[PDB]
Homo-oligomer: A and B are copies of this chain.
């Protein structure tokens, strides 16, 4: 018998508590990503921006649902910046719904983003994976012209 390492015990305790915290975080983040992937999978060519704004508000409510313990994490800040870029996606949506969306317009935008697309399925998850925050200049030039 000897003085047991209480450092190991407190390490186990903090590991367990942070593990449960991050498990709740992973549940919330899995819900967030599945919903955003589901909505961005559709072309949303003839779908008003307001039904994506309401999803934005729902994401905000989900981000405010968990206590402040996650709100101090890098994942919370990343999801908040994702929400900011998601209202940027709303900013984009007007171009998606715009009368601008022509075949030659599609080809010029495609050349700007260098990706390859199939017209039948306009899965805008791909157009957002090509980050609009990253390629803002080229898409803005296309929108202006």
Contact = CB atoms under 8 A, between A and B. Distances in A.
A49 to B, nearest CB: 12
Interface string A34-50: 00000000111111000
Given A43-B46, A44-B46, 5 more contacts: A42-B45, A42-B46, A44-B45, A45-B45, A45-B46
Chain A, interface size category, equals under 10
A47 B44 CA distance: 9
Interface centre among A42, A43, A46, A47 (most CB of B within 10 A): A46
Interface of A: 42-47, 121
A106 to B, nearest CB: 16
Contacts of A44: 45-46
5 contacts: A42-B46, A43-B45, A43-B46, A43-B47, A45-B45
A124 to B, nearest CB: 10
Contacts of A42: 45-46
A18 to B, nearest CB: 41
Q: Most chain-B CB neighbours within 10 Å: which of A42, A45, A121?
A: A45
A29 to B, nearest CB: 26
Nearest to A41: B46
Contacts of A121: 46
Contacts of A43: 45-47
